[PDB]
CSV table of C-alpha atoms in Angstrom, one decimal:
chain,number,residue,atom,x,y,z
A,718,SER,CA,111.6,114.7,120.4
A,719,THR,CA,110.7,112.4,117.8
A,720,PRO,CA,108.2,112.5,114.9
A,721,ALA,CA,105.7,110.7,117.0
A,722,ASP,CA,105.8,113.2,119.9
A,723,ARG,CA,105.4,115.9,117.7
A,724,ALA,CA,102.5,114.5,115.7
A,725,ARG,CA,101.0,113.3,119.2
A,726,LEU,CA,101.1,117.2,120.0
A,727,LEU,CA,99.4,118.2,116.8
A,728,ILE,CA,96.9,115.3,117.1
A,729,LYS,CA,96.0,116.3,120.8
A,730,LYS,CA,94.9,119.6,119.0
A,731,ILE,CA,92.6,118.1,116.3
A,732,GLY,CA,88.9,117.1,116.9
A,733,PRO,CA,86.8,114.8,114.9
A,734,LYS,CA,85.7,117.3,112.2
A,735,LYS,CA,89.3,117.9,110.9
A,736,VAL,CA,90.4,114.4,111.1
A,737,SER,CA,87.2,113.1,109.0
A,738,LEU,CA,87.4,115.9,106.5
A,739,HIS,CA,91.2,114.7,105.5
A,740,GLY,CA,90.4,111.1,105.8
A,741,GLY,CA,91.5,109.8,109.1
A,742,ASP,CA,89.7,107.2,111.8
A,743,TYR,CA,89.0,109.0,114.9
A,744,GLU,CA,88.7,106.4,117.2
A,745,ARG,CA,92.4,105.6,116.3
A,746,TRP,CA,93.3,108.8,116.6
A,747,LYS,CA,91.5,109.4,120.0
A,748,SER,CA,93.5,106.6,121.3
A,749,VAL,CA,96.7,107.7,120.0
A,750,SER,CA,96.4,111.2,121.6
A,751,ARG,CA,101.1,104.6,119.3
A,752,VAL,CA,101.3,107.1,116.3
A,753,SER,CA,101.1,105.4,112.7
A,754,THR,CA,102.1,106.9,109.4
A,755,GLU,CA,98.6,107.1,108.5
A,756,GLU,CA,98.3,109.9,111.4
A,757,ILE,CA,101.3,111.8,109.6
A,758,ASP,CA,99.5,111.7,106.4
A,759,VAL,CA,96.1,113.0,107.4
A,760,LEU,CA,98.4,115.6,110.0
A,761,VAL,CA,99.8,116.5,106.6
A,762,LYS,CA,96.6,117.1,104.9
A,763,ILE,CA,95.4,119.4,107.9
A,764,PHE,CA,98.7,121.1,108.4
A,765,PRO,CA,100.5,121.2,105.3
A,766,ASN,CA,102.9,124.1,106.5
A,767,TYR,CA,103.7,121.2,109.3
A,768,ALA,CA,105.3,118.8,107.2
A,769,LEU,CA,108.8,119.7,108.0
A,770,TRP,CA,108.5,120.1,111.8
A,771,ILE,CA,106.4,116.9,112.3
A,772,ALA,CA,109.4,115.2,110.1
A,773,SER,CA,112.5,116.9,111.7
A,774,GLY,CA,111.5,119.3,114.6
A,775,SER,CA,112.8,122.3,112.1
A,776,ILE,CA,110.9,125.0,110.8
A,777,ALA,CA,111.3,126.8,107.5
A,778,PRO,CA,108.8,129.7,106.9
A,779,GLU,CA,111.0,130.9,104.1
A,780,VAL,CA,109.1,128.1,102.3
A,781,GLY,CA,105.8,128.3,104.1
A,782,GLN,CA,106.9,125.4,106.6
A,783,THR,CA,106.4,126.3,110.2
A,784,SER,CA,105.1,125.2,113.7
A,785,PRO,CA,102.0,125.3,116.0
A,786,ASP,CA,104.2,127.4,118.3
A,787,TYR,CA,105.5,129.5,115.4
A,788,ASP,CA,102.4,130.3,113.9
A,789,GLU,CA,100.6,131.2,117.6
A,790,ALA,CA,103.9,133.5,118.4
A,791,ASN,CA,103.5,135.0,115.1
A,792,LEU,CA,100.0,136.1,115.4
A,793,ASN,CA,100.5,139.6,117.1
A,794,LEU,CA,103.5,140.2,115.6
B,520,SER,CA,102.1,109.1,96.8
B,521,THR,CA,102.0,108.7,101.0
B,522,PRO,CA,104.5,109.1,103.4
B,523,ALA,CA,104.8,105.5,103.6
B,524,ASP,CA,105.2,104.9,100.1
B,525,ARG,CA,108.3,107.8,100.2
B,526,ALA,CA,109.5,106.2,103.3
B,527,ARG,CA,109.4,102.9,101.8
B,528,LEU,CA,111.5,103.8,98.7
B,529,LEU,CA,114.3,105.2,100.7
B,530,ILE,CA,114.3,102.0,103.1
B,531,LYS,CA,115.0,100.0,100.1
B,532,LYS,CA,118.2,102.1,99.2
B,533,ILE,CA,119.5,101.6,102.6
B,534,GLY,CA,121.3,98.6,104.3
B,535,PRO,CA,122.1,97.5,107.7
B,536,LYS,CA,125.0,99.7,108.1
B,537,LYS,CA,123.3,103.2,107.9
B,538,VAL,CA,120.4,101.6,109.8
B,539,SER,CA,122.1,100.6,112.6
B,540,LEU,CA,124.4,103.4,112.8
B,541,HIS,CA,121.2,105.7,113.4
B,542,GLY,CA,119.4,103.3,115.8
B,543,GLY,CA,117.2,101.2,114.0
B,544,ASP,CA,116.3,97.6,113.6
B,545,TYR,CA,116.9,96.1,110.7
B,546,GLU,CA,115.0,92.9,110.7
B,547,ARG,CA,112.0,95.2,110.8
B,548,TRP,CA,113.4,97.4,108.1
B,549,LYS,CA,114.1,94.4,105.8
B,550,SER,CA,110.7,93.2,106.0
B,551,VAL,CA,109.0,97.1,105.6
B,552,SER,CA,111.3,97.0,102.5
B,553,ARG,CA,104.2,98.2,106.7
B,554,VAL,CA,106.0,101.7,107.6
B,555,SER,CA,106.2,102.8,111.4
B,556,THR,CA,106.7,106.3,112.7
B,557,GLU,CA,110.2,104.8,114.1
B,558,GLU,CA,111.3,104.3,110.5
B,559,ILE,CA,110.7,108.0,109.8
B,560,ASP,CA,112.8,108.9,112.4
B,561,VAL,CA,115.8,106.7,111.5
B,562,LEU,CA,115.4,108.0,107.7
B,563,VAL,CA,115.4,111.7,108.9
B,564,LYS,CA,118.7,110.7,110.9
B,565,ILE,CA,120.3,109.1,108.2
B,566,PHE,CA,118.9,111.9,105.3
B,567,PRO,CA,117.8,115.3,107.1
B,568,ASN,CA,118.0,116.6,103.9
B,569,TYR,CA,114.7,114.2,103.0
B,570,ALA,CA,112.5,115.2,105.8
B,571,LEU,CA,110.2,117.6,104.1
B,572,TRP,CA,110.0,115.1,100.9
B,573,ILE,CA,109.1,112.1,103.1
B,574,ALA,CA,106.5,113.9,104.9
B,575,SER,CA,104.7,115.8,102.1
B,576,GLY,CA,106.1,114.8,98.7
B,577,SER,CA,107.4,118.6,98.4
B,578,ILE,CA,111.3,119.8,98.2
B,579,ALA,CA,112.4,123.1,99.4
B,580,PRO,CA,116.3,123.0,98.2
B,581,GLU,CA,116.3,126.7,99.3
B,582,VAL,CA,116.7,125.4,102.8
B,583,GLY,CA,118.7,122.2,102.1
B,584,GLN,CA,115.4,120.1,101.8
B,585,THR,CA,115.6,118.0,98.8
B,586,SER,CA,114.7,114.4,97.4
B,587,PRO,CA,116.7,111.2,96.1
B,588,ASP,CA,115.8,111.9,92.7
B,589,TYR,CA,116.8,115.7,92.9
B,590,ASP,CA,120.0,114.6,94.6
B,591,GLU,CA,120.9,112.5,91.8
B,592,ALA,CA,119.6,114.8,89.2
B,593,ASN,CA,121.8,117.8,90.8
B,594,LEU,CA,125.0,115.7,90.6
B,595,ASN,CA,126.5,116.5,87.2
B,596,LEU,CA,125.0,120.0,86.9
């Protein structure tokens, strides 16, 4: 996986409300769902806990850095 | 600062050798020094310890995530 793949996965999950609250352009967002640095900035704003995962594919819950799958998996635990 | 600003700072520091060893295109790299997702992938490959900082501006040395200034500041310590 690449930073673009992981960003795109998150982007597919977000709708216009969260995008616009964090300063992104939805019409670009909609078609991206290629990925730009702008989209990474907005994603980090929406999900500060996903910064490390977007960039590297790694997590570090020790410091609050997780993933969408980790957070879902960690709900009922 | 944005992810692009922090990537650009690193990009200015790297030359053709490290870029090409990690799969980037230097001619694009040279002019970037706007930033693309591709450049983030290569930067994370060159500096896996800078993934969190590029994406968010935060560090987490607890898990090996630092910054160029942190690493320099932590040399003689």
